[PDB]
Design an enzyme around this catalytic site. Sequence first.
Site, PDB file in Angstrom:
ATOM      1  N   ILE B  38       7.162  66.656  69.868  1.00 18.57           N
ATOM      2  CA  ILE B  38       7.378  65.230  69.660  1.00 18.57           C
ATOM      3  C   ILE B  38       6.754  64.865  68.320  1.00 18.57           C
ATOM      4  CG2 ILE B  38       6.935  62.894  70.488  1.00 18.57           C
ATOM      5  CD1 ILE B  38       6.697  64.095  73.327  1.00 18.57           C
ATOM      6  N   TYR B  39       7.537  64.234  67.451  1.00 15.53           N
ATOM      7  CA  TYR B  39       7.042  63.754  66.170  1.00 15.53           C
ATOM      8  C   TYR B  39       6.829  62.246  66.218  1.00 15.53           C
ATOM      9  CZ  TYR B  39       7.917  68.282  64.005  1.00 15.53           C
ATOM     10  OH  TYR B  39       7.883  69.618  63.670  1.00 15.53           O
TER      11      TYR B  39
END
Lengths: 175, 175
Positions: B38-39
């Site tokens: 997840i960014y």
Amino acid sequence: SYIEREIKLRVISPSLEEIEERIRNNYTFINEEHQIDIYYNNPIRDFRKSDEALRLRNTNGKVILTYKGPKQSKETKTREEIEVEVSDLHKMDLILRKLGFIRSFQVEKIRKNYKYADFIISLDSIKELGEFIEIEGINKTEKELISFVDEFVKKHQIQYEKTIKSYLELLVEHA
Amino acid sequence: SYIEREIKLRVISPSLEEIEERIRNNYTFINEEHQIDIYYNNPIRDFRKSDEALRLRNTNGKVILTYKGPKQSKETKTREEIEVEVSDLHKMDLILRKLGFIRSFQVEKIRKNYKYADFIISLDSIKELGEFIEIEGINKTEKELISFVDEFVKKHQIQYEKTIKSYLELLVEHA
Ligand SMILES: [Ca+2]
Ligand SMILES: [Ca+2]
């Protein structure tokens, strides 16, 4: 993410050593925690305004990152608390500083934890502030916690003063 | 906090399966990593502008928070990288969202890691992008890494294309 409810007492008398002696017989000792806390602030969302906190704690070498939400009560210290253990304090600190967070203050203490039938009593000696006691209740209502603390201070003849302020808030005031 | 230097190859031919067969005999298998990333982005400091990243990775159940600094090279993927293991992805995600960070994207992959005399070869199959190879060098200069990758692709007859773009950047482009 979950609600942390506690009552904090500034101890007037007797000494915490004497209080340990008074509770030693009916309260079960858990552990002693040397806790060094670093608090942070957001440059564009003052936490002092929002009543939020971001803390990086070193307790007996265990590293904990904790977010605290605004207070939900005037009778006890009640805030949402989200904590995760991290592997390296130096790197977690670097990441926070890299993201824009700035170190706002440090709180250092020795906490002795005692348990008594679903209640955790923490005898806190706070560097530069003084001697305090915190009580938490496990699955307890605000009314159960308040009632137990009243029984606690009476049973052990403790002169005290209640406060819902954080150690960080009180240390500022003391300075 | 320290410099991560790698070269990324988009594989044209043969398949990664065939490349595994070609290197199986001289390269030592390390492990296979199922990585879900997840960014995040900062609302007031666009990371796309600053060339920075904040990532929360789940690799075979291990949870890693990573900050990546801007690129330091045009010949290889070279960025400052600071990582810490955290205890709970859900809570670390909640803390980030509570601090104001917003989830910007997700990258999912299967990575097979191989080692060959101070070089780590990662056969990457990236969900929705395709088959890639990443190489890193342990205590190696940019010139040593570039030279080894040239030898690597030649020795195993790999048709390829070099890129210093991140999987996140390339997935955006692909969409
Ligand atoms: Ca407390
Ligand atoms: Ca990479």
